[PDB]
Amino acid sequence: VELPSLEDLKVQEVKVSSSVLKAAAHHYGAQCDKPNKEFMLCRWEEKDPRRCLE
């Protein structure tokens, strides 16, 4: 099979601790709502997270 390159990696990972990540944790997803549910259809409905990387 095939795998995408070392490019489209090394993007800005949110380097925070787990407690400060669970600190807000409630106002975070409650107002963004545009890429996440689309990303869920990109993962739940369609499998193979290799067409699903963007």
């Binding site: 409630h26 890429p35 990303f39 869920m40």
Partner: protein, 67 residues
Amino acid sequence: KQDMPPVGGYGPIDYKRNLPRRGLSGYSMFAVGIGALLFGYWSMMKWNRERRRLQIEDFEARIALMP
């Protein structure tokens, strides 16, 4: 002439046998038992249901993140 038997001063002590210090008998008991027992159940549903409210709150933070 110096013998014993005194002129007076006697009791006696009893040969009696009694100490009926009762004691809250006769349907007064089983009454403090049942009401305090349901009082403990009355203390429930204000804590378990309250912790159940926090239990959905705990699972809320898991579902909000993880996309």
